[PDB]
Write a protein that binds this ligand. Structure first.
Ligand SMILES: CC(=O)N[C@@H]1[C@@H](O)[C@H](O)[C@@H](CO)O[C@@H]1O
Ligand SMILES: [Ca+2]
Ligand SMILES: [Ca+2]
Ligand SMILES: [Ca+2]
Ligand SMILES: [Ca+2]
Length: 182
């Protein structure tokens, strides 16, 4: 049985190898069990300094979501998160606008909708629009990582052509695609 909560299923992975791109982080995820799990109910993390994977920086980064960590990971040089679950969206057009250090990839219903395939100091990208064909819970996943230094990850989403943006949070997230009443 999988937990039903108003959030995405979160996994954290650390490494002492360099993360340069999405492929490197995805290979890390494939290579082992998560170093920690958590509920990603308020997806606006950071900003902090001095490596996400060191000390209590992950806790600080995750903030309101850190109380759901399964463990306190030990130190690593590099690290990142893999989030998966569902997001309620009505049919229509949307676009992400993401602030991040380092890179990331967001997919909805199996298609990338926001990609930065490289390391970077803090930068905000307004991504191209995509369509949702049928109202309801859409499949979503995210990866983000820190190669070292500062760290921040705030995907925001617009339903109104980029006039207003919102954080993905417990209003619309579901871990399993069932309706959460939490
Ligand atoms: C203090 C600071 O912003 N450091 C950033 C670091 O977070 C980022 O990962 C790197 C990418 O090459 O550029 C920088 O060094
Ligand atoms: Ca794994
Ligand atoms: Ca720690
Ligand atoms: Ca590194
Ligand atoms: Ca960094």
């Amino acid at each position: 049985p999988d937990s039903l909560f108003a959030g995405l299923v979160g996994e954290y992975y650390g490494t002492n190898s360099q993360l340069n791109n999405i492929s490197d982080f995805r290979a890390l995820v494939d290579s082992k069990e998560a170093d920690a799990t958590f509920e990603a109910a308020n997806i606006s993390y950071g900003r902090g300094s001095s490596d996400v994977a060191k000390g209590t920086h992950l806790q600080e980064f995750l903030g309101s979501d850190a109380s759901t960590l399964s463990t306190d990971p030990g130190d690593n040089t590099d690290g990142g998160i893999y989030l998966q679950g569902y997001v309620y969206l009505e049919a229509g057009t949307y676009n992400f606008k993401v602030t991040a250090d380092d890179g990331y990839e967001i997919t909805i219903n199996g298609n990338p909708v926001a990609t930065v395939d490289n390391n970077q100091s803090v930068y905000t990208v307004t991504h191209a629009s995509f369509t949702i064909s049928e109202s309801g819970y859409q499949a979503i996943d995210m990866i983000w990582w820190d190669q070292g230094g500062d760290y921040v990850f705030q995907p925001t989403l617009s339903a109104d052509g980029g006039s207003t943006y919102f954080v993905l949070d417990s209003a619309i997230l579901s871990s399993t695609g069932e309706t959460p009443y939490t």
